[PDB]
Design a protein around this ligand. Sequence first.
Ligand code: CHL
Ligand code: CLA
Ligand code: CLA
Ligand code: CLA
Ligand SMILES: CC(=C/C=C/C=C(C)/C=C/C=C(C)/C=C/[C@@]12O[C@]1(C)C[C@@H](O)CC2(C)C)/C=C/C=C(C)/C=C/[C@@]12O[C@]1(C)C[C@@H](O)CC2(C)C
Ligand SMILES: CC1=C(C/C=C(\C)CCC[C@H](C)CCC[C@H](C)CCCC(C)C)C(=O)c2ccccc2C1=O
Ligand code: SF4
Lengths: 40, 64, 211, 208, 163, 146, 211
Amino acid sequence: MKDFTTYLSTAPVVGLGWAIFTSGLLIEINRFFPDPLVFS
Amino acid sequence: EIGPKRGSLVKVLRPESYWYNQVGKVVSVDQSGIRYPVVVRFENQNYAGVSTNNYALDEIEEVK
Amino acid sequence: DRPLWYPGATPPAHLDGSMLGDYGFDPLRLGTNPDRMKWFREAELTNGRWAMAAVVGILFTDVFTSIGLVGLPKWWEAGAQTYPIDNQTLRTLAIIEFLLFGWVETKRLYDLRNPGSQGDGSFLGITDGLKGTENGYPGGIFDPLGYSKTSPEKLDELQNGRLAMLAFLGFASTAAVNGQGPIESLQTHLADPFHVTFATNGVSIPHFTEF
Amino acid sequence: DRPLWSPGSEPPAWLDGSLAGDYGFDPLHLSEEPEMRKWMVQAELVHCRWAMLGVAGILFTSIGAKAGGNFPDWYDAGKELQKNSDIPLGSLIFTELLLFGWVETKRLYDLRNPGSQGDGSFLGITDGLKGKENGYPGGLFDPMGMSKNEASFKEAKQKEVKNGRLAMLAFVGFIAQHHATHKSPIDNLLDHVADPFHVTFATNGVSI
Amino acid sequence: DIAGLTPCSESKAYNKLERKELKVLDKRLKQYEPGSAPYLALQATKERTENRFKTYAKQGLLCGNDGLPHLISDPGLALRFNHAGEVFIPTFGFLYVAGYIGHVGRQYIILSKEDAKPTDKEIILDVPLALKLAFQGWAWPLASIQELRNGSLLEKDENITVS
Amino acid sequence: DFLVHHAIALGLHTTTLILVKGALDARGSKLMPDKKDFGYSFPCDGPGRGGTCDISAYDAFYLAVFWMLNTIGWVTFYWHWKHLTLWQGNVSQFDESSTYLMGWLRDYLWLNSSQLINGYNPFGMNSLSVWAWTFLFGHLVYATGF
Amino acid sequence: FTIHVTVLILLKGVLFARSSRLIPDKANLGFRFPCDGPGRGGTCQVSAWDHVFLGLFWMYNSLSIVIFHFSWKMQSDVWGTVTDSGVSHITGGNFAQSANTINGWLRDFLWAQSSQVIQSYGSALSAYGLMFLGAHFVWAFSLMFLFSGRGYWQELIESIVWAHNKLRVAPSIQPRALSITQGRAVGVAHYLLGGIATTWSFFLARIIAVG
Ligand code: CHL
Ligand code: CLA
Ligand code: CLA
Ligand code: CLA
Ligand SMILES: CC(=C/C=C/C=C(C)/C=C/C=C(C)/C=C/[C@@]12O[C@]1(C)C[C@@H](O)CC2(C)C)/C=C/C=C(C)/C=C/[C@@]12O[C@]1(C)C[C@@H](O)CC2(C)C
Ligand SMILES: CC1=C(C/C=C(\C)CCC[C@H](C)CCC[C@H](C)CCCC(C)C)C(=O)c2ccccc2C1=O
Ligand code: SF4
């Protein structure tokens, strides 16, 4: 398990988790709050 | 003793070198009158892949 | 060191040393370098001291307002009530506020840089009174009540000052989604606590679940 | 030296047998490290203790509903009780989230640092509010002296876990045989006792 | 107004563009039945489109002769004519986020280089350390000016040159 | 017109980068501390040191010409279309369609290449046949350089 | 013509892989190597790997016309709607007259059949209009890698490393420009992807919107 967690700490695996976060965050912020252009 | 101490870090002053104004460990020093006795080892590789090079007394100076 | 903001196991690194209102609260480690920790300390005071004297104008007056003794306006619309008055003082107030503070504050700015640095003949004749005991705690400004040896009445100055800094942040936020004053917001939480809150009525969260 | 989940299988090296409810069951090699093992035993117990506390609430109401009392199904109970309540939703949530953040956070820092909450900061309480073990506190959460004996405390830990594993399996049952029958658990029981051979999962019209 | 631009509320082409984009959906909506899912999907798109147009008008935007909204960049005209949310304010919303990424990556680089084998720490990250710095960077402008005024931000002629 | 004047700025600042670099790093680089001994134009220093293809200052000028032509192309495409809409009377063509790149491909290139391409049709030939022939002649010479 | 040539590039690489007159010892250098050196007037792209890298460009030029042959022939002479009086083909049977000229391939195939792709904005085929453009970007983007060389880029990174070094934010993994063979591979990849994806958009949008 120590080696499994180490594999998960590699660059591409951590980058995958980053991408799902930043992408899912932006999408759900466009799912709700649709079409922002001017900021109030 | 002719030159810097074993295991001592020194800064390079060859303008040609990849390691210029950079620091490296002194691996050894020869006291037989050679022109470039001081052997130095760096962690970072050069463009070819070599991490050591023999420098001179005047070309090296104290760290930082 | 006074007690810890977490009761349990949050070791601070540089706050074990003496300082006022030390509760070991610096997660972001913005007070590592001592030179700028010395600067942020004075910032907590000028914000603390200023915020408290400000909160009274919102608090001491609105209590008298809700009871009905005086008919003063609320802080969220006190500014638009002054200038329409016939005898008014239209906005040369922003600049005079800066010309007057600019004289005092730079005298305070040059004190932190050079402590006790007020020359002999610089001011008319009161050059001696302007010297301070410490940074942030000068001598000749207070007339009584600063000769004790256990000087930490200062802890009261901070715990009261940090508290007021929360007040104005709550006044400004309450007065942006509730639409009413601070005391009017209090009379409602007492009359109907569960209905008037930041969750359901005060739109601080998008809660629309009608079922 | 002890029973196991599958007789004859070599137990893992890290499961020595001291923990409560240890039968050598960890094929995924989880809790192989000490720190994760220290975290999971506390996760198992809260998932257990909440199951017992909750499942008993379902049986009490579903029995009172079958007897005649005015109790609804455990499902669609939060929907019909909020329609006619003086407490709006949102004021009830963040009364729960805010109050649990106190407890759930104090329990965390006893985990990361045992004996840390017994400093006396919280209302001058020192002897209590310091952990006897990882997931087993005492002093204040054990008013009756039912833990000051290692002989009777070690087997009680085995009963807390055995009646707990069973309990949070039952909650998975309620979810499953509700979606199939859309009836209460007790009603499904009396049907099986009435005609055991005919009314089973095979004849519910689902799962086939 | 400014620059010979009309507000989007008063413009005719702006409303012309609304009547056009809705007419496409109404024609597309005729094919399907009322209670079907394609009908619900198009009605939602109709609801979003009606909301997009009214919100841009309510926000004091400026529409040109073509009928599309235009943005203004000078903070002077933006603040004078109440168009600050367009460009001027998002400028500070980005730079807070961008400097967050620099202050974080700069700290992970410095701290891993203080230990043995920093090359392994780049390809195999120390996730506990990375999350620690990522939640400590909320106040990166304070640390920058702290590090600039101190002088430990920049290196001083200990860098490689070429001649 | 706003987006193009900024896209033109991309050309001048990056074209200058390629040429400025080939000048200042003409005397020497860390990869080649003595370029000055070889000359302005030499092929390379070999596959050693990871590869040394296109280091000389001649090879910087060589790469900048591709950007010179790209930059002047944007500058010149912007002149022609903005003036055609003026001469045709329909200025709204440029204002609405020049904001997205399919407008350049649809309304400027694809559209105005109709009379040209029909210079020599299978039915007959107009006076623009010499230009359509040259129009391919350049589409060919360009490819032979590849 | 395109086939006998594509064989020449690959078959030459095979037979001359082990040895040649210019380089009697290639086998010791290996399968993929960029060059022996500038000597002999130049020995760039002499390996067998670099023959494959060239053959892909000719495979592309070959099948791209096998595909255009299938589209224009079948649209003009085969496909179409049958009416009471014969068949009405899609392009009116213009393969016989226009195809003999190269301008015909430019006029009647490219300029004409690109109307469905270009006018796809605002419809369900809008994705093909974007892929049609993005495929051109990735194609031209490849030209940086094929035309240029590793030398210019490794020097540029040094001036960039200075700034990253000046701010004490530099990678312990030193940045190095791509190898020679990699720049060639990266080129043909982004090249073929952009060349092939353009047809994939030009065709499906043309044919789904029939005619
Ligand atoms: C030649 C240029 C000169 C400049 C640029 C400054 C700049 C400064 N001095 Mg001097 N000083 C200068 C000359 C001199 N200073 C002094 C003596 C001092 C002292 C003793 C002090 C300063 C301070 C200051 C600061 C004042 C900031 C401020 O409040 O400004 C904003 C602008 C103003 C204050 C001007 C306002 C206009 C005004 C005077 C109008 C007067 C009419 C009345 C208002 C009418 C009454 C109406 C009633 C109803 C209100 C600033 C750093 C202070 C400081 O920070 O020290 C560290 C300070 O304590 N200066 C002398 C005599 C030796 C000078 C001789 O040339
Ligand atoms: C720190 C002092 C303080 C106090 C006493 C109050 C009190 C109150 N706020 Mg308030 N508020 C504060 C700060 C404070 N606020 C700050 C700093 C903000 C900005 C984040 C807000 C934002 C806010 C909104 C948006 C709303 C209220 C509302 C209310 C009222 C109903 C309770 C509620 O919604 O939960 C309060 C919810 C919070 C998130 C703040 C609680 C957290 C504080 C910091 C804990 C402090 C501990 C303890 C209470 C201190 C005791 C002090 C006491 C003995 C004097 C009540 C009078 C509601 C209203 O409409 O009033 C009728 C409402 O809609 N508040
Ligand atoms: C399954 C197939 C597969 C694929 C598609 C990749 C793809 C990649 N690997 Mg890789 N890898 C694989 C299997 C694979 N690997 C296996 C089996 C191992 C053995 C465990 C490794 C071990 C490995 C190491 C040790 C490293 C990579 C790295 C990389 C990346 C190259 C660096 C780069 O161009 O970004 C350059 C990036 C920057 C200059 C700045 C950071 C911004 C990035 C792009 C954001 C994160 C991207 C994210 C990972 C994308 C999601 C994953 C994607 C494939 C869907 C690239 C994304 C390197 C890396 O750092 O990955 C990010 C690296 O150091 N790989
Ligand atoms: C979330 C609840 C939970 C948690 C945290 C644990 C935790 C633990 N159990 Mg435990 N257990 C549970 C539920 C749980 N159990 C249930 C319900 C049963 C009865 C079926 C058991 C029966 C059991 C035995 C017999 C033994 C353990 C053991 C252990 C320990 C060894 C490491 C391990 O596997 O844990 C790591 C656990 C997790 C990371 C949780 C993962 C949860 C997954 C993602 C859910 C999978 C869904 C599942 C496939 C479908 C559910 C429906 C199903 C009922 C049809 C550890 C303390 C062993 C031990 O050392 O004793 C102390 C041991 O011998 N457990
Ligand atoms: C099955 C379960 C349930 C937790 C279950 C969690 C539980 C039971 C807590 C539930 C909350 C409750 C019951 C409250 C409910 C109510 O509030 C409402 C919602 C509705 C109201 O009507 C009534 C009341 C009661 C008020 C746990 C499952 C975990 C398992 C099997 C883990 C397996 C592993 O770890 C090991 C063992 C080792 C490996 O070999 C296999 C793996 C996979 C690696
Ligand atoms: C450009 C170029 C380079 C430089 C190219 C490099 C250094 C490759 C750059 C790879 C980057 C780092 C990949 C990542 C790119 C983006 C950051 C990915 C987007 C990620 C965001 C979404 C976060 C060469 O080294 C070269 C060598 C030989 C012949 C031609 C060339 C050549 O043309
Ligand atoms: S690096 Fe360039 S110049 Fe040198 S041998 Fe290879 S192709 Fe020839």
